[PDB]
Amino acid sequence: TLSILVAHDLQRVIGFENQLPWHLPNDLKHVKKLSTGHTLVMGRKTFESIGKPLPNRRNVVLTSDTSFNVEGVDVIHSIEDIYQLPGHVFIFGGQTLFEEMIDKVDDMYITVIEGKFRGDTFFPPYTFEDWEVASSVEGKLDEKNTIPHTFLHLIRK
Numbered sequence: 001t002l003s004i005l006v007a008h009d010l011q012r013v014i015g016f017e018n019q020l021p022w023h024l025p026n027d028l029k030h031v032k033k034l035s036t037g038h039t040l041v042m043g044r045k046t047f048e049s050i051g052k053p054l055p056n057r058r059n060v061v062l063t064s065d066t067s068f069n070v071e072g073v074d075v076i077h078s079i080e081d082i083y084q085l086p087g088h089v090f091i092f093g094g095q096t097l098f099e100e101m102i103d104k105v106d107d108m109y110i111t112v113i114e115g116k117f118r119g120d121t122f123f124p125p126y127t128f129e130d131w132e133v134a135s136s137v138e139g140k141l142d143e144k145n146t147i148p149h150t151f152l153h154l155i156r157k
């Protein structure tokens with residue numbers, strides 16, 4: 001299985017100055033649940049914005065930099081290398097990788113942040129005409145999660 005995993009706002013904003021424009025604990029819990037034991041694939045900027053691999057899953061970074069070798073990180077150099085990864089593989093970001101992979105994924109796990117943030121990086125446009133709603137779950141609000149959000153699992157038609 002090849003899946004996208006993304007949090008985007010109402011305008012499909014995903015990033016601002018190599019950070020997430022929002023803090024949402026629930027969505028981190030969502031990601032843990034979903035990806036632990038599996039593989040995450042990310043572009044070099046996405047990785048470098050955190051600088052440390054996520055524990056308890058396979059962290060793969062795509063880059064043209066042939067001297068990239070962070071401990072706990074496996075490296076790939078082409079889009080093609082993705083199809084050679086065994087298991088459930090999550091396209092994890094960022095914008096440029098999402099743009100390359102959106103027409104190739106089986107399904108998408110989208111967290112919709114029901115807000116409008118300033119951004120410089122965006123999830124590619126998509127229409128529901130192409131995607132079946134497998135599930136739509138409204139996120140729960142509290143003191144730690146103050147921003148409305150919806151977990152969408154979308155499967156290609």
Ligand SMILES: NC(=O)C1=CN([C@@H]2O[C@H](COP(=O)(O)OP(=O)(O)OC[C@H]3O[C@@H](n4cnc5c(N)ncnc54)[C@H](OP(=O)(O)O)[C@@H]3O)[C@@H](O)[C@H]2O)C=CC1
Pocket residue numbers: 005006007008013014015016017018019020042043044045046047049062063064065077078079092093094095096097098100121
């Ligand atoms: N909200 C969310 O769910 C997510 C948001 N983000 C955000 O996205 C932003 C980063 O996005 P973006 O700027 O597009 O960068 P990316 O994370 O997509 O990384 C881009 C880099 O990945 C490498 N790469 C991509 N495609 C290829 C290829 N086909 N062959 C070889 N290398 C390739 C290149 O690295 P190199 O230059 O070294 O060759 C390229 O410069 C950040 O702001 C981050 O916060 C990221 C993930 C999720």
Ligand SMILES: CCc1nc(N)nc(N)c1C#C[C@@H](C)c1cc(OC)cc(-c2ccncc2)c1
Pocket residue numbers: 005006007020027028030031046047049050051052053054059091092093109110111
């Ligand atoms: C969760 C935010 C998020 N939510 C959703 N629904 N999809 C995503 N693809 C991302 C994402 C992402 C990128 C920016 C990322 C890469 C990374 O490299 C492994 C570590 C983290 C991270 C680890 C723990 N705490 C904060 C951030 C985030």
